[PDB]
Design a protein around this ligand. Structure first.
Ligand SMILES: CCC1=C(C)/C(=C/C2=NC(=C\c3[nH]c(/C=C4\NC(=O)[C@H](C)[C@H]4CC)c(C)c3CCC(=O)O)/C(CCC(=O)O)=C2C)NC1=O
Ligand SMILES: CCC1=C(C)/C(=C/C2=NC(=C\c3[nH]c(/C=C4\NC(=O)[C@H](C)[C@H]4CC)c(C)c3CCC(=O)O)/C(CCC(=O)O)=C2C)NC1=O
Ligand SMILES: CCC1=C(C)/C(=C/C2=NC(=C\c3[nH]c(/C=C4\NC(=O)[C@H](C)[C@H]4CC)c(C)c3CCC(=O)O)/C(CCC(=O)O)=C2C)NC1=O
Ligand SMILES: CCC1=C(C)/C(=C/C2=NC(=C\c3[nH]c(/C=C4\NC(=O)[C@H](C)[C@H]4CC)c(C)c3CCC(=O)O)/C(CCC(=O)O)=C2C)NC1=O
Ligand SMILES: CCC1=C(C)/C(=C/C2=NC(=C\c3[nH]c(/C=C4\NC(=O)[C@H](C)[C@H]4CC)c(C)c3CCC(=O)O)/C(CCC(=O)O)=C2C)NC1=O
Ligand SMILES: CCC1=C(C)/C(=C/C2=NC(=C\c3[nH]c(/C=C4\NC(=O)[C@H](C)[C@H]4CC)c(C)c3CCC(=O)O)/C(CCC(=O)O)=C2C)NC1=O
Ligand SMILES: CCC1=C(C)/C(=C/C2=NC(=C\c3[nH]c(/C=C4\NC(=O)[C@H](C)[C@H]4CC)c(C)c3CCC(=O)O)/C(CCC(=O)O)=C2C)NC1=O
Lengths: 160, 162, 35, 162, 160, 160, 162, 160, 162, 160, 162
């Protein structure tokens, strides 16, 4: 979270929070309500986002579902869409937290080794996250989509 | 280190569930109390040296044997380490209050502290008395509500040590 | 700390580069011309 | 570490004797089994990542709780940690097999692993299941003769954890 | 080579080579003729090995050449077979050297970030080197087939 | 042994054994039979080797058994012969192990400290080991003599 | 560490008093023996190798099994470790004799040494016999006045192990 | 002390004390008699030194004892003179020890943080130490005056 | 460092072509002398101390001024440096011989060695005589066939110095 | 010299020489003439010290001059005596300088390896230098013989 | 480094000769000068701050551009470095004076000092002027007899920079 990150930065320097961290926390708690509304928007329509993003991903990379691909079969495609559900939930967690700390801790640390064991192509994950970002920015209105995109951007940069 | 928001995020992640009304209620409560927390934290940050001075004076007045020869706070280095410890307790209570959770106290303060003091020979009861001295000193500066809020963390430190 | 108590990084982030006291171990530095 | 040849050497050193017929028989047994050991070691080195893949997949299919939310293997971090532990187990079991002794398993792996897992919260039962999964996966790859030799070391790791 | 590693290991401890190091060098140079004729057999079989290895690669992994895959198109397949030729040449170099060092300083050190730059799946790489192992070990004699297959094992493990 | 050194070398680098290490293990396992025959030959002739080596050493270095020498007297000469017996046993251990690892860990690490503590001259150790080398390789055939001479070489170089 | 001067300084600083007649008499007593202590330390430093030689020879004459196959000191490595430990004991006894206090033995030698030896399998009784051999050898070289002082620190080491 | 410093230096290198530092200890135990006499002189005249230095300081710095001053009042002036007594005792300890180490450990390390916590001005500390130096130097002989002034200047520089 | 095999690998890799008949013949030539090189290295390993001792004795008998006061070899430290240099030269000549390449000498031994000796005042001529002395002493023991292949590298070292 | 050691220490902790060190240097320079008398007295008695020490060594160790011994023969015994002369001169140098640093820089740094290269027993060296101590101490008065015995003992410990 | 005594030691070691009358004359000369050297060294050590005071004042008065913005003395850290350099020069001049030989100055102060100052932009001439400032203040303070001796080392440093 923003508060946890500020506290950690202050502890690293063994000092109390200065006016900068304090008023950034005040801004963060002031804007918490609109963050909650944005998270509600993505939570209520999660299945739409997952299905649209899976469709766009398979359009861009049909080889994933093709014979010999990792997403070949109904079960493996279900696992793909379930991973997209995981990452959407993590993105909503990051939105409510105001930081990418939940995304990083739950789904970025060790993602390379995990998807290597599963033999999942990381680039395919990248287009999947980009499709999710396009859909989510489609649903959100104006500046809200902006910050949501940032989280998705980070996730893409995390996976590439 | 987890605050209230991170605690809700974790309790919803371990279940694999998306956020619902109850989680939004909890986060809204934290956002409501955030302004009080920030004001109290700023007040304590501005007056940290005064709080430490007042509380150390009160403790060494109530227990003068500490700073007299034969007391654990008798040398310049040991007095410095004593006020340094009081600075730790105040700063980390400020962190815990701002986060809204006592995880940082089990997490960065009280883990192995009893063993450390017992190895050093530091008095535990006197340190608890000093933590209180800081609590009464800080409550007056921060006001009634912020004192009620910081009291849970100071009492947490006292109970963990005791 | 094996040395000055108030040089711990938790209280003093710059305590590592602080001046050594008589409480600290022997410090061996190689100033011999580093040719 | 210590292997079979060094084991014979060490026992005859402690006893302070030259080699007898029994020692030469033990050494001949090791020399007989060595070529099979080398074949199995090369096979496992070739297929290490594969063996880990099917063994982990089998374990997480038999115990789907681990990978699902609230499971010990549920995170990218925790899943990668599980795969890393399994890779360590496979590599050191291969070392023990090629050596012909389980001493390396005692020192490098087993001396401290139970306490580590108990402090971390890792389920030891599921870890023994993962080791058994690696055993039955690698048996089909190395061949029956090499499977018999590798099984004793996988059983040694499983018994050390249990 | 074997002599290179032995000399470096002896020099690190500032001491002459041990009887074990001398024994391994003696065994290496004693088997020079066999590994040399093995490398000759491998090098005289450029295109059969390359083409059959590519065929097994593409028929076990159809999605490399499928639209959207890494090797889709004629030029990308040509680059695939070119890399196969590279690794075959490296295997010959390692066979004559008696060690996998030439493969390491040429083809193993930095291969992961190389193929991550090229967006080349590593499971595809290990499948390709496995196919080349099969094709090459088919041609060689039983005694020499194992010697070739051990270096192919090292290459397959090194890729993924 | 050969297996132990290869495995510790692999483990220090967090890797499986390389093809060269596996080939070296294969060679050692193949030669184990002649290794054991040589070890039996040396073990059976231990008393003759010790007697002749002691006589030759004291003929080459009469100062050791001269008055004031470290080996003056029947008891100290007996202890000298006992040390020769130790080192012959260690040589047989090194032969069966295929490496000088048992020799190093049992009788080379800290031997200079031990002989400084015992007023035992290391040069005398050197001619004693050379005498054992001569006497022992006198009994063995040429191929056996070479391998046993390598181990006596290592021991003499370590004492020197 | 803490020598006799620093020991008196600490025992008077903890009380908060100035040096009185008794303290000054203790300081005089320490300063009187300074020449004897320096002479003994120089003598031991000059003859340390000889002392370890004779002490080890007597210890392994009384207990030959230590340096025979199956004994804790049977190898070149373990014999060297034995004589290294004896050298450490002699050097630290010399330090304690120079300082006139046994603090350095407790905080540089005897801190966890008994359990270190127990974990290693080192025979503590044989180590004590070696320390006694070192004491009786050193006494002849240093002279009776210095022998009496070296004895107390040798017995302090012996009681620390025992 | 000098003995402790020499022993620590010899221990850090894992060696016996060299003849030079043994000569240093010899000189220290030689000077012990006169250094004890100096320390005893300081101990006997402690009340006179404390009264003289306190009066001199309070005249030199009227602000400390004036209302609003740190030492204003009976109890606070008593605390001031008690601190002076601590530092005089520390200087006696340093004289007997032959180095400033007792002074450093007991009353120098962390002194600035202590007096910062106590709102005690450090320039007043320095002037009080200088006043005690002048008074003591006046009371004892010229030859020992330099030795005492060494410790007093160390304390003054440390407090500065 | 690179031997003959690594050198041909470098050439054929920068050229980008597989091995041809000429390089196969070159590898045959290396493998032919591998046995002799290993045997010579094994011989030199034992006699390194003896070769260095005899070379130092001959060099200092021919040039006693070096060890007499005012000479460059006159001290324990400078005599140490002299015999250490000869040890290094012998070892690196053995390394180059077993590798079959003189590049290892250039990378470590001869990189500015003349300038360093002139800077420190070491006589180049007497170093050349020491290298030559090591040459005949080694050749007397290795055997004429090994003597030639060792003397080629000794001559290379001498010519590099002079 | 004492001055050199004091200066290198002062430079090491980086401050001007402490008053105690100035006292030490004055004590050293004020005693220089006595050291010069000691050095001259030892120089006048070169031959007696050297030859009596050599005789004592060869009485304790007949093997060193026995056939096969290190010092067997007239020329090798002469080299023995010349080494003793070297060390006697170094001891006089150290007495003049006031410490053992000349003896280190000329005779101790690398002595072990050198006598190993010459196959000279270090126990013989310590016996010889102890004999030189015994001879040289008698020539001098008690106060001076103590100082000279310090250097001889230090050299004996350094050799051992 | 080397002082006056060690210079005689080395001159007689290179010849290999024992001490003779001329050596004793040189040594007695140094011993006689020793008391003056010690007294001057103590005077400098007591007042070193004051010499720095006056020398820095005079140097910056002659060249005010340094302290002013754009000069090489313009900032607190850089001014502190400026005065610390003069402290270095005074301390090492005192060391060389007390030793009696200028070798320490070559080994430590002037070993690459000119090149380092040129790279850092330090003006050699201005630092030299500071050197004569310290030299003249020292000459005034310590009396003409010790002034003549200290001037040798000061002009040595000045010419080393020059
Ligand atoms: C934030 C978590 C944390 C805590 C709490 C902590 C306490 C702590 N206090 C210490 C020393 C000390 N602490 C004290 C304080 C006590 N003496 C008086 O009696 C008082 C009653 C009382 C304080 C109110 C003293 C006197 C010392 C010096 C002991 C010594 O130096 O031997 C030390 C050892 C010196 C060091 O390295 O800092 C620690 C670790 N350290 C931590 O990382
Ligand atoms: C909350 C954080 C988190 C994540 C993200 C996570 C990923 C994850 N992905 C998995 C499998 C999978 N993941 C995918 C997805 C792939 N399909 C295509 O190739 C695409 C390139 C790509 C998606 C865009 C597929 C197909 C599988 C099935 C692989 C198999 O069955 O072997 C599994 C194994 C499921 C099981 O064993 O029951 C996990 C745990 N785990 C976590 O704890
Ligand atoms: C000697 C060591 C060495 C290697 C190995 C090497 C590999 C290599 N492969 C390349 C391209 C390529 N390589 C491949 C091969 C992949 N296609 C399939 O997925 C297979 C799994 C796999 C081959 C078996 C492909 C598809 C490309 C084209 C990628 C692109 O369009 O950028 C390139 C870029 C140059 C070019 O495009 O012509 C390099 C440098 N380079 C070296 O110096
Ligand atoms: C397996 C590893 C190992 C070794 C090698 C070893 C050697 C060893 N030799 C010893 C005695 C001895 N060793 C020798 C040998 C010397 N005599 C001549 O000088 C020769 C140059 C030379 C032998 C070739 C002698 C003379 C003694 C008797 C020393 C004495 O009586 O004081 C001792 C003292 C204990 C005892 O006598 O039982 C040891 C520990 N110990 C070990 O644990
Ligand atoms: C042995 C090492 C040691 C020292 C040095 C030490 C100093 C010390 N001085 C104290 C009080 C004090 N000390 C002073 C001294 C100041 N008054 C003027 O400003 C002067 C500039 C200056 C003295 C020359 C004063 C005024 C107080 C009373 C502070 C107060 O009660 O508010 C206290 C508080 C505890 C008590 O009063 O008993 C300490 C710990 N304690 C130690 O254990
Ligand atoms: C592993 C690669 C390597 C090489 C090749 C090597 C040679 C070498 N010898 C050196 C010094 C030396 N070399 C000698 C040897 C000379 N004494 C004379 O009598 C002889 C003519 C001659 C030898 C035959 C001496 C005496 C010194 C020390 C000179 C001094 O300390 O001033 C130095 C300068 C380092 C020093 O100050 O000691 C090098 C680099 N060192 C290395 O690390
Ligand atoms: C100033 C420092 C220094 C020292 C100490 C020194 C010693 C020294 N002794 C030497 C020879 C020798 N030294 C000795 C003496 C040993 N024989 C044993 O019996 C005795 C225990 C012992 C003497 C007490 C002998 C016998 C030789 C002849 C070795 C030979 O030529 O084979 C040599 C070789 C040159 C020569 O043969 O003349 C040196 C360099 N050189 C130095 O620059």
């Amino acid at each position: 979270s923003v508060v946890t990150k500020a506290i950690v930065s202050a502890d690293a320097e063994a000092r109390y929070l200065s006016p900068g961290e304090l008023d950034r926390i005040r801004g963060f708690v002031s804007s918490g309500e609109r963050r909650l509304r944005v998270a509600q928007t993505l939570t209520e329509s999660r299945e739409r986002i997952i299905k649209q993003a899976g469709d766009q991903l398979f359009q861009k990379r049909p080889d994933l579902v093709s014979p010999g691909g990792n997403a070949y079969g109904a079960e493996r495609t279900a696992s793909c869409l379930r991973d997209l559900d995981y990452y959407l939930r993590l993105v909503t967690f990051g939105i409510v937290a105001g930081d990418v700390t939940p995304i990083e801790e739950i789904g970025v640390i060790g993602v390379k080794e995990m998807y290597r064991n599963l033999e999942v192509p990381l680039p395919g994950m990248v287009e999947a996250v980009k499709a999710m970002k396009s859909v989510a920015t489609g649903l959100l209105s104006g500046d809200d989509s902006a910050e949501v995109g940032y989280y998705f951007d980070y996730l893409a940069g995390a996976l590439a | 280190m987890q605050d209230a928001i991170t605690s809700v995020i974790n309790t919803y992640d371990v279940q694999g569930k998306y956020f619902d009304t109850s989680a939004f209620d909890k986060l809204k409560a934290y956002y409501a109390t955030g302004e009080l927390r920030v004001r109290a934290a700023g007040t304590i940050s501005a007056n940290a040296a005064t709080i430490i001075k007042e509380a150390s004076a009160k403790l060494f007045s109530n227990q003068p044997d500490l700073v007299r020869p034969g007391g654990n706070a008798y040398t310049t280095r040991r007095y410095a380490a004593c006020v340094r410890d009081m600075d730790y307790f105040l700063r980390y209570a400020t962190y815990a209050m701002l986060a809204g959770d006592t995880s940082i106290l089990d997490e960065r303060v009280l883990n192995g502290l009893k063993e450390t003091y017992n190895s050093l020979g530091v008095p535990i009861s006197s340190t608890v008395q000093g933590i209180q001295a800081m609590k009464e000193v800080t409550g007056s500066l921060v006001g009634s509500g912020a004192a009620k809020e910081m009291g849970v963390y100071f009492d947490y430190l006292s109970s963990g040590l005791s | 700390r094996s040395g000055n108590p108030i040089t711990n990084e938790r209280g003093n982030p710059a305590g590592g580069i602080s001046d050594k006291t008589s409480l600290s171990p022997q410090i061996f530095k190689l100033t011999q011309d580093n040719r």
